[PDB]
Amino acid sequence: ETLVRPKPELLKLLKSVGAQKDTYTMKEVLFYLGQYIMTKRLYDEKQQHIVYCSNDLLGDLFGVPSFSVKEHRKIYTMIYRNLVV
Amino acid sequence: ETLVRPKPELLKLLKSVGAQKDTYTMKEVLFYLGQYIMTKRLYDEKQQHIVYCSNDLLGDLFGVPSFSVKEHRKIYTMIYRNLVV
Amino acid sequence: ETLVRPKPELLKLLKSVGAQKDTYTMKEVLFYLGQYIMTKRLYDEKQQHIVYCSNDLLGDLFGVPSFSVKEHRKIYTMIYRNLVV
Ligand SMILES: CCOc1cc(OC)ccc1C1=N[C@@H](c2ccc(Br)cc2)[C@@H](c2ccc(Br)cc2)N1C(=O)N1CCN(CCO)CC1
Ligand SMILES: CCOc1cc(OC)ccc1C1=N[C@@H](c2ccc(Br)cc2)[C@@H](c2ccc(Br)cc2)N1C(=O)N1CCN(CCO)CC1
Ligand SMILES: CCOc1cc(OC)ccc1C1=N[C@@H](c2ccc(Br)cc2)[C@@H](c2ccc(Br)cc2)N1C(=O)N1CCN(CCO)CC1
Ligand SMILES: CCOc1cc(OC)ccc1C1=N[C@@H](c2ccc(Br)cc2)[C@@H](c2ccc(Br)cc2)N1C(=O)N1CCN(CCO)CC1
Ligand SMILES: CCOc1cc(OC)ccc1C1=N[C@@H](c2ccc(Br)cc2)[C@@H](c2ccc(Br)cc2)N1C(=O)N1CCN(CCO)CC1
């Protein structure tokens, strides 16, 4: 049980999909992020592993137009930058 | 910020010297244990780096009668078992 | 409470971390030196117990490129060379 504290904007994001805490485990962070992408359909209708986030609050936070769910380190890094760490 | 959550006993120990939260960074955890040990003089006054936790809550929580503050890995481990981690 | 007087060099250093006295108590100093090192990020990233001070005033004061926080007398010996009396 290793918790993290998301910054104001990220916490706003997680909370838009049901999150209710201030600190979370990374597992929870990724879960909520996953749900958010799926819910707002930021993934490519054709190939679901490609995420197109430009034009969304998510794009702002990750600072990239798109990314692959395979790029784990890149993903951990983009989340990192959004952590009161 | 990387937070951990102390089990009830460790949490009493921590709060017995001033702690006021439920989750802490390991830096804050070790800071407090430091104070607890100093405030109760569990350290050997003839070798200040040796800690004798025998017959003390810290001893029941760490499962050792003594240890050196130089055994970092050992200390992180004894602390791990007292974490809802 | 045995107050101590840090030479000009070291005295100026402690100050940089928000210290306000010409004399302190070892417990106070070490706490600050620890703060200096940490936030200054002078420790090996995969072994926080290793301190790389070269390329820093601290290395000057101690006269060492690096050292381990486990080297206790050495850290005392080094601070005793930075103290009046
Ligand atoms: C948004 C679509 O994401 C996927 C697409 C895939 O296409 C084949 C396969 C796996 C995923 C997927 N992997 C998950 C994940 C978790 C942590 C890290 Br680090 C990386 C990836 C996790 C995820 C979490 C956060 C972020 Br950011 C990106 C991906 N995650 C998911 O969100 N999904 C939703 C889509 N489905 C399809 C179900 O058949 C699989 C799981
Ligand atoms: C999300 C996966 O994270 C891990 C996976 C690991 O697999 C080898 C090992 C360690 C971690 C881990 N390291 C933590 C961390 C904290 C600060 C910085 Br700077 C860097 C890393 C911290 C972390 C924090 C932010 C980010 Br981004 C990535 C990792 N963090 C975790 O969240 N962990 C470690 C503990 N475990 C379960 C152990 O019983 C869950 C995952
Ligand atoms: C209780 C005895 O404490 C010491 C005695 C020493 O003898 C020379 C040297 C260092 C310490 C000391 N080191 C600190 C520490 C922090 C993290 C890890 Br992991 C290990 C050690 C930290 C500590 C924290 C938690 C735990 Br468990 C053990 C040690 N801690 C302290 O509590 N200190 C700092 C050093 N001095 C200054 C006055 O003599 C005594 C108090
Ligand atoms: C005390 C320092 O610990 C680290 C030092 C590192 O060196 C770079 C890297 C990662 C960590 C680190 N790993 C985390 C962790 C959590 C669960 C498990 Br199971 C294993 C490891 C978790 C941890 C939890 C409990 C215990 Br016991 C030991 C480590 N955790 C941390 O405590 N931290 C705090 C310090 N930061 C960087 C601060 O600038 C990194 C993460
Ligand atoms: C800056 C990192 O320092 C450490 C790294 C360690 O790595 C495992 C373990 C213990 C310490 C540590 N020991 C403390 C200390 C106090 C008096 C003397 Br004599 C020697 C050491 C004291 C210190 C004081 C002055 C100087 Br010089 C060097 C170290 N002190 C600290 O500064 N810290 C701060 C960081 N934390 C992380 C815990 O998760 C541990 C304790």
Coordinates of C-alpha atoms and ligand atoms in Angstrom, one line a residue:
Chain A
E1 CA 0.0 0.0 0.0
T2 CA 2.1 2.9 -1.4
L3 CA 0.0 6.0 -1.7
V4 CA 0.5 9.1 -3.9
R5 CA -1.1 12.6 -3.9
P6 CA -2.4 13.8 -7.3
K7 CA -2.1 17.5 -8.0
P8 CA -5.3 19.7 -8.2
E9 CA -5.9 19.1 -11.9
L10 CA -5.3 15.4 -12.0
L11 CA -7.4 14.9 -8.9
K12 CA -10.2 16.8 -10.7
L13 CA -9.8 14.2 -13.5
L14 CA -9.9 11.1 -11.3
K15 CA -12.8 12.6 -9.5
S16 CA -14.8 13.1 -12.6
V17 CA -14.9 9.3 -13.0
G18 CA -15.8 8.5 -9.4
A19 CA -12.7 8.9 -7.4
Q20 CA -13.4 10.2 -3.9
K21 CA -10.0 10.4 -2.0
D22 CA -6.9 12.7 -2.0
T23 CA -4.2 10.1 -2.0
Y24 CA -4.3 6.9 -4.0
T25 CA -2.3 3.8 -4.8
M26 CA -0.8 3.9 -8.2
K27 CA -3.1 0.9 -9.1
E28 CA -6.1 3.1 -8.4
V29 CA -4.6 6.0 -10.4
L30 CA -4.1 3.9 -13.5
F31 CA -7.5 2.3 -13.1
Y32 CA -9.3 5.7 -12.9
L33 CA -7.2 7.0 -15.8
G34 CA -8.1 3.9 -17.8
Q35 CA -11.8 4.4 -17.1
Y36 CA -11.6 8.1 -18.0
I37 CA -10.0 7.3 -21.4
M38 CA -12.6 4.6 -22.2
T39 CA -15.5 6.7 -21.0
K40 CA -14.7 9.8 -23.1
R41 CA -13.4 7.5 -25.8
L42 CA -10.0 9.0 -26.3
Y43 CA -8.8 5.7 -27.7
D44 CA -8.6 5.0 -31.5
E45 CA -11.9 3.3 -32.5
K46 CA -9.8 1.0 -34.8
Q47 CA -6.7 0.2 -32.6
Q48 CA -7.7 0.6 -29.0
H49 CA -4.1 0.7 -27.7
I50 CA -3.4 4.2 -29.2
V51 CA -4.6 7.1 -27.1
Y52 CA -5.4 10.4 -28.7
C53 CA -5.5 12.9 -25.9
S54 CA -4.9 16.2 -27.7
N55 CA -7.8 18.6 -27.1
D56 CA -8.7 17.1 -23.7
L57 CA -7.8 18.0 -20.1
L58 CA -5.8 14.7 -20.2
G59 CA -3.6 16.0 -23.1
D60 CA -2.8 19.1 -21.0
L61 CA -1.7 17.0 -18.1
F62 CA 0.4 14.5 -20.0
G63 CA 1.6 17.2 -22.4
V64 CA 1.5 15.0 -25.5
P65 CA -0.9 14.7 -28.5
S66 CA -1.2 10.9 -28.2
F67 CA 0.5 7.8 -26.8
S68 CA 0.4 4.0 -26.7
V69 CA -0.8 2.2 -23.6
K70 CA 2.2 0.0 -24.2
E71 CA 4.7 2.8 -23.3
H72 CA 4.6 2.0 -19.6
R73 CA 7.5 4.1 -18.5
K74 CA 6.4 7.1 -20.5
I75 CA 3.0 6.7 -18.8
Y76 CA 4.5 6.4 -15.3
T77 CA 6.6 9.5 -16.1
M78 CA 3.6 11.6 -17.3
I79 CA 1.7 10.7 -14.2
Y80 CA 4.7 11.4 -12.0
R81 CA 4.8 15.0 -13.3
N82 CA 1.2 15.3 -12.0
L83 CA 1.9 14.1 -8.5
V84 CA 2.5 16.2 -5.5
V85 CA 5.7 14.2 -5.2
Chain B
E1 CA 5.5 12.4 -1.9
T2 CA 5.3 8.7 -1.3
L3 CA 2.9 7.8 1.5
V4 CA 2.7 4.7 3.7
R5 CA 0.1 3.8 6.4
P6 CA 1.3 2.6 9.8
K7 CA -0.5 -0.3 11.5
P8 CA -2.3 0.7 14.7
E9 CA 0.5 0.0 17.1
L10 CA 3.2 1.8 15.1
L11 CA 0.7 4.6 14.7
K12 CA 0.3 4.9 18.5
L13 CA 4.1 4.9 18.8
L14 CA 4.3 7.7 16.2
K15 CA 1.6 9.8 17.8
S16 CA 3.1 9.3 21.2
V17 CA 5.8 11.8 20.1
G18 CA 3.7 14.3 18.2
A19 CA 2.6 12.8 14.9
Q20 CA -0.9 13.9 13.8
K21 CA -1.8 12.1 10.6
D22 CA -2.6 8.5 9.4
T23 CA -0.4 8.4 6.4
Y24 CA 3.3 9.5 6.2
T25 CA 6.3 9.6 4.0
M26 CA 9.0 7.3 5.1
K27 CA 11.1 10.3 6.0
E28 CA 8.5 11.4 8.5
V29 CA 8.2 7.9 9.9
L30 CA 11.9 7.6 10.5
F31 CA 12.1 11.1 11.9
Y32 CA 9.5 10.2 14.6
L33 CA 11.0 6.8 15.5
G34 CA 14.2 8.7 16.0
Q35 CA 12.5 11.0 18.5
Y36 CA 10.7 8.1 20.3
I37 CA 14.0 6.4 20.7
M38 CA 15.7 9.6 22.0
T39 CA 12.9 10.7 24.2
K40 CA 12.8 7.2 25.9
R41 CA 16.6 6.8 25.9
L42 CA 16.5 3.4 24.3
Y43 CA 20.0 4.1 22.8
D44 CA 23.1 3.0 24.7
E45 CA 24.7 6.1 26.2
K46 CA 28.2 4.5 25.7
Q47 CA 27.5 3.7 22.0
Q48 CA 24.8 6.0 20.9
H49 CA 24.3 4.2 17.5
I50 CA 23.2 1.0 19.3
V51 CA 19.5 0.8 20.1
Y52 CA 18.1 -1.5 22.8
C53 CA 14.4 -1.9 22.3
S54 CA 14.1 -4.9 24.6
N55 CA 11.2 -4.5 27.0
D56 CA 9.6 -1.7 25.1
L57 CA 6.8 -1.3 22.5
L58 CA 9.4 -0.7 19.8
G59 CA 10.9 -4.0 20.7
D60 CA 7.5 -5.7 20.2
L61 CA 7.0 -3.9 16.9
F62 CA 10.5 -4.6 15.5
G63 CA 10.9 -8.1 16.8
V64 CA 14.5 -7.6 17.9
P65 CA 16.1 -6.9 21.3
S66 CA 18.6 -4.5 19.7
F67 CA 20.0 -3.1 16.4
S68 CA 22.4 -0.6 15.0
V69 CA 21.1 2.6 13.3
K70 CA 23.7 1.7 10.6
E71 CA 21.6 -1.3 9.5
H72 CA 19.3 0.7 7.2
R73 CA 18.1 -2.3 5.2
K74 CA 17.3 -4.1 8.4
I75 CA 15.4 -1.0 9.7
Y76 CA 13.4 -0.5 6.5
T77 CA 12.3 -4.1 6.8
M78 CA 11.3 -4.1 10.5
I79 CA 9.3 -1.0 9.6
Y80 CA 7.8 -2.7 6.5
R81 CA 6.0 -5.3 8.7
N82 CA 4.3 -2.5 10.6
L83 CA 2.9 -1.0 7.4
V84 CA -0.6 -1.5 6.0
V85 CA 1.7 -1.5 2.8
Chain C
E1 CA 22.4 21.7 26.0
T2 CA 26.0 22.2 24.9
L3 CA 26.0 25.0 22.4
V4 CA 28.7 25.1 19.8
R5 CA 30.3 27.8 17.6
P6 CA 30.7 26.9 13.8
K7 CA 33.6 28.6 12.1
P8 CA 32.9 31.3 9.4
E9 CA 32.8 28.7 6.6
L10 CA 30.4 26.1 8.2
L11 CA 28.5 28.8 10.0
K12 CA 27.6 30.4 6.7
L13 CA 26.6 27.0 5.4
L14 CA 24.1 26.1 8.2
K15 CA 22.6 29.6 7.6
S16 CA 21.7 28.7 4.0
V17 CA 19.1 26.2 5.2
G18 CA 17.3 28.7 7.4
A19 CA 19.4 28.6 10.5
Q20 CA 19.6 31.5 12.9
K21 CA 22.4 31.4 15.6
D22 CA 26.1 31.7 16.0
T23 CA 25.8 28.7 18.2
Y24 CA 23.5 25.7 18.3
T25 CA 23.2 22.2 19.7
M26 CA 24.5 19.2 17.7
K27 CA 21.0 17.9 17.5
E28 CA 20.0 21.1 15.7
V29 CA 23.0 21.1 13.4
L30 CA 22.8 17.5 12.2
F31 CA 19.1 18.2 11.5
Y32 CA 20.1 21.1 9.2
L33 CA 23.1 19.4 7.6
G34 CA 20.6 16.6 6.9
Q35 CA 18.2 19.0 5.3
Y36 CA 20.9 20.7 3.3
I37 CA 22.1 17.4 1.8
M38 CA 18.6 16.1 1.1
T39 CA 16.9 19.0 -0.7
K40 CA 20.3 19.8 -2.2
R41 CA 20.2 16.3 -3.6
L42 CA 23.8 15.3 -3.0
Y43 CA 23.2 11.6 -2.2
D44 CA 23.5 8.7 -4.6
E45 CA 20.1 8.1 -6.0
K46 CA 20.2 4.3 -5.5
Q47 CA 21.9 4.5 -2.1
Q48 CA 20.7 7.6 -0.2
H49 CA 23.3 6.7 2.4
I50 CA 26.1 7.8 0.1
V51 CA 26.9 11.5 0.0
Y52 CA 28.6 13.1 -3.0
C53 CA 29.7 16.5 -1.8
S54 CA 32.5 17.5 -4.2
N55 CA 31.4 20.4 -6.4
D56 CA 29.9 21.8 -3.3
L57 CA 31.0 24.0 -0.3
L58 CA 30.3 21.0 1.9
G59 CA 33.1 19.1 0.3
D60 CA 35.3 22.1 1.1
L61 CA 34.4 22.2 4.8
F62 CA 34.8 18.5 5.2
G63 CA 37.7 18.1 2.7
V64 CA 36.2 15.1 1.0
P65 CA 34.6 14.5 -2.4
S66 CA 32.1 12.1 -0.8
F67 CA 31.2 10.1 2.3
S68 CA 28.7 7.8 3.9
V69 CA 26.2 8.8 6.6
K70 CA 27.3 5.7 8.4
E71 CA 30.7 7.2 9.0
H72 CA 29.8 8.7 12.3
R73 CA 33.0 9.8 14.0
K74 CA 34.2 11.0 10.6
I75 CA 31.1 13.2 10.3
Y76 CA 31.8 14.4 13.9
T77 CA 35.6 14.8 13.2
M78 CA 34.6 16.8 10.1
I79 CA 32.2 19.1 12.0
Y80 CA 34.7 19.5 14.9
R81 CA 37.2 21.0 12.3
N82 CA 34.4 23.5 11.5
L83 CA 33.8 24.5 15.1
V84 CA 35.3 27.2 17.3
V85 CA 36.3 25.2 20.5
Ligands
LIG1 C1 -7.2 2.8 -23.0 C2 -7.0 1.4 -23.5 O1 -6.0 0.8 -22.8 C3 -5.7 -0.5 -23.3 C4 -5.9 -0.8 -24.6 C5 -5.6 -2.1 -25.0 O2 -5.8 -2.5 -26.4 C6 -5.6 -3.8 -26.7 C7 -5.0 -3.1 -24.1 C8 -4.8 -2.7 -22.8 C9 -5.2 -1.4 -22.3 C10 -4.9 -1.0 -20.9 N1 -3.7 -1.3 -20.2 C11 -3.8 -0.8 -18.8 C12 -2.5 -0.2 -18.4 C13 -2.3 0.1 -17.0 C14 -1.1 0.6 -16.6 C15 -0.1 1.0 -17.5 BR1 1.5 1.8 -17.0 C16 -0.3 0.7 -18.9 C17 -1.6 0.2 -19.3 C18 -5.1 0.1 -18.9 C19 -4.7 1.6 -18.9 C20 -4.7 2.4 -17.8 C21 -4.2 3.7 -17.8 C22 -3.8 4.3 -19.0 BR2 -3.1 6.0 -18.9 C23 -3.7 3.5 -20.1 C24 -4.2 2.2 -20.1 N2 -5.8 -0.3 -20.1 C25 -7.1 0.0 -20.3 O3 -7.5 1.1 -20.1 N3 -7.8 -1.0 -21.0 C26 -9.1 -0.5 -21.6 C27 -9.2 -1.2 -22.9 N4 -9.2 -2.6 -22.7 C28 -9.8 -3.5 -23.7 C29 -10.6 -4.6 -23.1 O4 -10.7 -5.7 -24.0 C30 -8.0 -3.2 -22.0 C31 -7.7 -2.4 -20.7
LIG2 C1 3.3 1.7 -9.9 C2 4.4 0.8 -9.8 O1 5.3 1.2 -8.8 C3 6.3 0.3 -8.4 C4 6.4 -0.9 -9.0 C5 7.4 -1.8 -8.6 O2 7.6 -3.0 -9.2 C6 8.9 -3.5 -9.2 C7 8.3 -1.4 -7.6 C8 8.2 -0.1 -7.0 C9 7.2 0.7 -7.4 C10 7.1 2.1 -6.8 N1 8.1 2.9 -6.5 C11 7.6 4.1 -5.9 C12 8.3 5.4 -6.3 C13 8.1 6.5 -5.6 C14 8.8 7.7 -5.9 C15 9.6 7.7 -7.0 BR1 10.5 9.3 -7.4 C16 9.8 6.6 -7.8 C17 9.1 5.4 -7.5 C18 6.0 4.1 -6.2 C19 5.7 4.9 -7.5 C20 5.1 6.2 -7.3 C21 4.8 6.9 -8.5 C22 5.1 6.4 -9.7 BR2 4.7 7.5 -11.2 C23 5.6 5.1 -9.9 C24 5.9 4.4 -8.7 N2 5.8 2.6 -6.4 C25 4.6 2.0 -6.3 O3 3.6 2.6 -6.4 N3 4.7 0.6 -6.1 C26 5.6 0.0 -5.1 C27 4.9 -0.9 -4.1 N4 3.9 -1.8 -4.8 C28 3.5 -3.0 -4.1 C29 4.5 -3.5 -3.1 O4 3.9 -4.4 -2.2 C30 2.9 -1.1 -5.6 C31 3.6 -0.2 -6.7
LIG3 C1 18.6 6.6 17.9 C2 20.1 6.9 17.6 O1 20.1 7.8 16.4 C3 21.4 7.9 15.9 C4 22.5 7.7 16.6 C5 23.8 7.9 16.1 O2 24.9 7.7 16.8 C6 26.1 8.4 16.4 C7 23.9 8.3 14.7 C8 22.7 8.5 13.9 C9 21.5 8.3 14.5 C10 20.3 8.4 13.6 N1 20.3 8.1 12.3 C11 19.0 8.4 11.7 C12 18.6 7.3 10.7 C13 17.6 7.6 9.8 C14 17.2 6.6 8.9 C15 17.7 5.3 9.0 BR1 17.1 4.0 7.8 C16 18.7 5.0 9.9 C17 19.1 6.0 10.8 C18 18.0 8.6 13.0 C19 17.2 7.4 13.3 C20 15.8 7.3 13.0 C21 15.1 6.2 13.2 C22 15.7 5.0 13.7 BR2 14.7 3.4 13.8 C23 17.0 5.1 14.0 C24 17.8 6.2 13.8 N2 19.0 8.9 14.0 C25 18.8 9.5 15.2 O3 17.8 9.3 15.8 N3 19.7 10.4 15.7 C26 20.6 11.2 14.8 C27 22.0 11.1 15.3 N4 22.0 11.5 16.8 C28 22.3 12.9 17.1 C29 22.6 13.1 18.5 O4 23.5 12.1 19.0 C30 21.1 10.8 17.7 C31 19.7 10.7 17.1
LIG4 C1 12.8 5.4 2.0 C2 13.2 5.5 0.6 O1 12.6 4.5 -0.2 C3 12.9 4.6 -1.6 C4 14.2 5.0 -2.0 C5 14.5 5.2 -3.3 O2 15.7 5.7 -3.7 C6 15.6 6.6 -4.9 C7 13.5 4.8 -4.3 C8 12.3 4.3 -3.9 C9 12.0 4.1 -2.5 C10 10.7 3.6 -2.2 N1 10.2 2.4 -2.6 C11 8.8 2.3 -2.1 C12 8.4 0.9 -1.8 C13 7.1 0.6 -1.5 C14 6.7 -0.7 -1.3 C15 7.6 -1.7 -1.4 BR1 7.0 -3.4 -1.1 C16 8.9 -1.4 -1.7 C17 9.3 -0.1 -2.0 C18 8.7 3.3 -0.9 C19 9.0 2.5 0.4 C20 8.0 2.2 1.3 C21 8.3 1.5 2.5 C22 9.6 1.1 2.8 BR2 10.0 0.2 4.3 C23 10.6 1.5 1.9 C24 10.3 2.2 0.7 N2 9.8 4.2 -1.3 C25 10.1 5.3 -0.6 O3 10.1 5.3 0.7 N3 10.3 6.5 -1.2 C26 10.6 7.7 -0.5 C27 11.7 8.5 -1.2 N4 11.5 8.6 -2.6 C28 12.1 9.7 -3.3 C29 12.0 11.0 -2.5 O4 12.6 12.1 -3.2 C30 11.2 7.4 -3.4 C31 10.1 6.6 -2.7
LIG5 C1 20.5 12.8 4.0 C2 20.4 11.3 4.1 O1 20.9 10.9 5.3 C3 20.6 9.6 5.6 C4 20.4 8.6 4.6 C5 20.1 7.3 4.9 O2 19.9 6.5 3.8 C6 19.2 5.3 4.1 C7 19.9 6.9 6.2 C8 20.1 7.9 7.2 C9 20.5 9.2 7.0 C10 20.7 10.2 8.1 N1 21.5 9.9 9.2 C11 21.4 11.1 10.1 C12 22.7 11.3 10.8 C13 22.8 12.1 12.0 C14 24.0 12.2 12.7 C15 25.2 11.6 12.2 BR1 26.8 11.6 13.1 C16 25.1 10.9 11.0 C17 23.9 10.8 10.3 C18 20.9 12.2 9.2 C19 22.1 13.1 8.7 C20 22.4 14.3 9.3 C21 23.5 15.0 8.9 C22 24.3 14.5 7.9 BR2 26.0 15.3 7.5 C23 24.0 13.3 7.3 C24 22.9 12.6 7.7 N2 20.2 11.5 8.2 C25 19.5 12.1 7.2 O3 19.9 13.1 6.7 N3 18.3 11.5 6.9 C26 17.4 12.2 5.9 C27 16.9 11.3 4.9 N4 16.3 10.1 5.6 C28 15.4 9.3 4.7 C29 14.6 8.3 5.5 O4 13.6 7.7 4.7 C30 17.1 9.4 6.6 C31 17.7 10.4 7.6

